[PDB]
Amino acid sequence: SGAIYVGNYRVVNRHLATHNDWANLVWEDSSRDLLVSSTTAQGCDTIARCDCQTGVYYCSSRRKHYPVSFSKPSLIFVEASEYYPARYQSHLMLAVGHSEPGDCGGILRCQHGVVGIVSTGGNGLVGFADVRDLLWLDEE
């Protein structure tokens, strides 16, 4: 679990969105595994606006933050689980690191701010949903 709180927005994995998120919806995209809802209070996270490929992510299944090198956002064919079908996920970055399904929502950050959130992984892979292109998160 986990979210980004920037301005009056809450950014979560689309597959973990609550009824309150859907009832206060700003934007959602299934191909990216992202959903954004509106908040009453202002958040403290800042979004990175950069092309960093090194940063640190939070892993809830280890209570630890790990430094990682990650790929540029791309369209990767994903994993067919017994929970979910196999499909193309867009704007996805991969790194070598531990993850479990419940780690989704953990933040990946660089020197500039928040880069994205945990969304895919396995066999020592963790994939993150990028948010650096969503410029509108910084206003309105």
Among ligand A1BTJ, Zn ion, none, residue 99 binds (CB under 5-8 Å by kind) = ligand A1BTJ
Catalytic entry in 59, 91, 104, 130: 104
Nearer to ligand A1BTJ among residue 103 and residue 130 (C-beta): 103
Report the nearest approach of ligand A1BTJ to the CB of residue 130 (Å): 14
82 Rama sector, left if φ>0, alpha if ψ -120 to 50, beta otherwise? alpha
DSSP string, the chain: ---EEEEEEEEEEGGG--HHHHHTEEEEETTTTEEEEEEEEEEE--B--S---EEEEEETTTTEEEEEE-PPSEEEE----SSS---EEEEEEEEE----GGGTTPEEEETTEEEEEEEEEETTEEEEEE-TT-GGGG--
Catalytic entry in 15, 29, 45, 98: 15
Query: Known catalytic residue: 104?
Result: yes
Report the nearest approach of ligand A1BTJ to the CB of residue 41 (Å): 28
Binding residue for ligand A1BTJ, selected from 15, 24, 56, 65, defined by CB under 6 A? 15
Structure tokens at 42: 């202002």
- Contact between 122 and ligand A1BTJ per CB under 6 A: yes
Catalytic entry in 21, 33, 103, 130: 33
- Contact between 104 and ligand A1BTJ per CB under 6 A: yes
Nearest Cα neighbor of 97 from 75, 74, 65 is 65
Among ligand A1BTJ, Zn ion, none, residue 15 binds (CB under 5-8 Å by kind) = ligand A1BTJ
Residue stretches of the annotated binding site for Zn(2+)? 50, 52, 110, 112
